[PDB]
Amino acid sequence: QVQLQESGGGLVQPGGSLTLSCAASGFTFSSYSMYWVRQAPGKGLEWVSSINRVGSNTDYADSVKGRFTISRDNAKNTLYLQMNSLKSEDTALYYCAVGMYAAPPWRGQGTQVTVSS
Ligand SMILES: [Cl-]
């Protein structure tokens, strides 16, 4: 079946880093642009980052620009998000998805990141 599995979340103090991974299976990963989106209580769903099919073009929400980096491995069918200089406001459940607004199975079940003093 179509599966997207996020991992790499954790609890970390502000200023710290994390790297999220998303293992894709059950479809041709290379045929899809990929997205990181995040949801946190009271803030709804907000887009974080996107990458085209081969990684030659990437985009970032304004709030994470210069701090986060999206990348993909089309051999391993894996999506990544390296996060630096984490803030409180980055606390959220992070999902990877084939679209900004995709729903399961085309969005994963998420990985929690909690940035707390
Ligand atoms: Cl909410």
Author numbering: 1 to 117
Lines from the paper:
To investigate the effect of furin binding on the structure of the antibody, we also solved the structure of Nb14 in its free state. Also here, no significant structural alteration could be found as also indicated by the low Cα-r.m.s.d. of 0.20 Å.
Furin1 belongs to the family of the calcium-dependent proprotein convertases (PCs). The classical PCs cleave after basic residue motifs, with furin preferentially recognising the motif R-X-K/R-R↓ (where “↓” represents the scissile peptide bond). Besides the subtilisin-like catalytic domain, all PCs require the so-called proprotein convertase domain (P-domain, for some family members also called Homo B domain) for catalytic activity. To unravel the binding epitope and the mode-of-action of the furin-inhibiting nanobody Nb14 we solved its structure in isolation as well as in complex with the target protease.
